[model samples]
Target: RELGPEELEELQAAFEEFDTDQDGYIGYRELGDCMRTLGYMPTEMELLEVSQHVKMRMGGFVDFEEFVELIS
Candidate 1:
């Protein structure tokens, strides 16, 4: 399914909420935290794995646009 602007905006807001550092990106650690907050509770390394593919940097962060493309 394709994402529309509204959906992207909603995702952006959700991402911002999880990205506590507000570095304009989401990292593996943050992803692990967010997953736990949402009850997914991913392992630290697994979270790192997923985030690395979706985010831009290594064990670091991913661009929102790249993440969106990954999911949708």
Candidate 2:
């Protein structure tokens, strides 16, 4: 699904909100928190699947660009 500008902006804000330390990347713990905040209760298996779907190229982390791609 393609996100219109407003939707993209909202998602970006959410992403930034989770980046608590203001680092460019969201670590595993932060992503987990964000997922839970978004109401996605992933099981262990689903957690394993997250890396595949979220385009997390950097080990154990996700940056805003990768996150935007996943949401869009």
TM-score of 1: 0.51
Model 1 lDDT tens row, 1-72: 575686667678778897678877775455445445443565566555675564565465666775566445
Clashing pairs for model 1 are 55-62, 56-62
Candidate 2: regions farther than 4 A off: 1-3, 29-47, 51-59
Q: Per-residue alpha-carbon lDDT of model 2 for 1-72, expressed as tens digits? A: 565776667667887788778787886545555556555664676556666654666667678887656543
TM-score for each predicted model, relative to the true structure? 0.51, 0.56
- Give the deviation of candidate 1 from the true structure as CA RMSD: 4.9
